[PDB]
Amino acid sequence: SRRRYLLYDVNPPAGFNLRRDVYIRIASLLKTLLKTEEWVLVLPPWGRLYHWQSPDIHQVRIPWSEFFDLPSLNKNIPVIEYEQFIAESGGPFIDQVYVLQSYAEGWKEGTWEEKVDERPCIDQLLYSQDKHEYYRGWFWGYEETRGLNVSCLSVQGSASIVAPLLLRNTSARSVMLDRAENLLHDHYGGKEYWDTRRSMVFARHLREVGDEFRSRHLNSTDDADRIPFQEDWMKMKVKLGSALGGPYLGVHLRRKDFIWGHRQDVPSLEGAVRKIRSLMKTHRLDKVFVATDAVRKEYEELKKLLPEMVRFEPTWEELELYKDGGVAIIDQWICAHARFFIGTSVSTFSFRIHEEREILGLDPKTTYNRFCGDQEKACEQPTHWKITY
Ligand SMILES: C[C@@H]1O[C@H](OP(=O)(O)OP(=O)(O)OC[C@H]2O[C@@H](n3cnc4c(=O)[nH]c(N)nc43)[C@H](O)[C@@H]2O)[C@@H](O)[C@H](O)[C@@H]1O
Ligand SMILES: *[C@@H]1O[C@H](CO)[C@@H](O)[C@H](O)[C@H]1NC(C)=O
Ligand SMILES: [Cl-]
């Protein structure tokens, strides 16, 4: 009716945890759009073109309902699930699809300017026309989706750089931004940002599972970890470093990249196990929870070196249920609540955890921490980004 719809997709290789960063980026834009007209973000169904990236078992068209808490998300910006977008608008039709791309001419130095232009497609377009002239595409796996018009947009700055073009230069009821990761954060550590990031609260069902785990195998519960909780994410502001954590060390070992001949910033199993023990003994920690994507061969090895290790291993049913990002989220949630945490270099999984601990109020010194390559000389820890309420 009175309102315009915003949709987006990201490059196919993008991970679950990155797609989450991009959502914040789009939020940033929408907010800016809402200052002028009536808009609503349409949540892109989870599940991915390269379906062999995820084990799952071929899981697709998953609604955000399964991962986050929608009412929570909505307190930040007006947001709706895709299946409902089809409900509201007549069919699964999109008026305009813009594919985002860099600038053909690239840039010399000095040439940095925020800007966006209609441009010829740098890369071969993936949308094909049907016998009816509609544009068929991947469309988050929704096979019947048809788009009305497709163009490319060269683009440079933050996400909101796009807003005017959408407001003035187009009439479309619904607009989709493909290759959205091309867009940058408006102002990253910003207060606008943190609003969005805090808005994404895990699906209740998921946290309950992690809380189950913490209570059972970790001797950890919210009260004993000195972390008061509040359902309304807005009503929860926390003096920094008040939250204690569970009597356990949280660790996230990101290993499936390693088939790379060499990477300076990831540790050997022995080398990492040494850090673990050093940490356990230092902070007087009893148990250690591990979130890891490791191969069975490597996990068996870890379990040898670290019998005291605890891991969350989902049953088939459990995974078919919570999907990949569901288990992913559980794994994160648990790490977030550990008294002290160490993650893997430049792993956007670990990044999300940093963000969670920073929301719970855990002292930063126990948050931003990373395993070092056995021989890597300059080993720079992750940057502390403080919440702004
Ligand atoms: C190298 C590139 O890195 C890019 O992200 P990259 O920084 O790895 O960082 P992540 O986004 O963590 O990539 C690992 C992905 O696999 C799953 N994953 C990784 N670690 C864990 C874990 O400990 N537990 C669970 N449940 N799941 C895990 C999760 O879905 C996560 O998004 C990727 O998007 C590209 O596909 C590519 O792989
Ligand atoms: C959009 O409209 C404005 C104002 O009418 C015009 O000046 C500008 O050239 C248009 N921009 C694009 C990218 O078409
Ligand atoms: Cl995904």
From Swiss-Prot:
Keyword annotations: Carbohydrate metabolism, Disulfide bond, Endoplasmic reticulum, Fucose metabolism, Glycoprotein, Glycosyltransferase, Golgi apparatus, Signal, Transferase
Any single GO CC term annotated in Swiss-Prot or TrEMBL for this entry: Golgi apparatus
UniProt key word Signal: yes
Regulation: Inhibited by EDTA and by Zn(2+).
Tissues where this protein is expressed: Isoform A is expressed in fetal liver and peripheral blood lymphocytes. Isoform B is expressed in spleen, lung, testis, bone marrow, thymus, pancreas, prostate, fetal brain, fetal liver and fetal kidney. Isoform C is expressed in brain, heart, spleen, liver, lung, stomach, testis, placenta, skin, thymus, pancreas, mammary gland, prostate, fetal brain, fetal liver and fetal heart.
Gene Ontology terms describing biological process: fucose metabolic process; mesoderm formation; positive regulation of protein folding; protein O-linked fucosylation; regulation of epithelial to mesenchymal transition; regulation of gene expression; regulation of secretion
UniProt-annotated binding residues for GDP-beta-L-fucose: P13, A14, G15, F16, N17, H252, L253, R254, D331, T348, F349
Cellular location(s): Endoplasmic reticulum; Golgi apparatus
Pathway the protein acts in: Protein modification; protein glycosylation
Protein name as catalogued: GDP-fucose protein O-fucosyltransferase 2
Organism encoding this protein: Homo sapiens (Human)
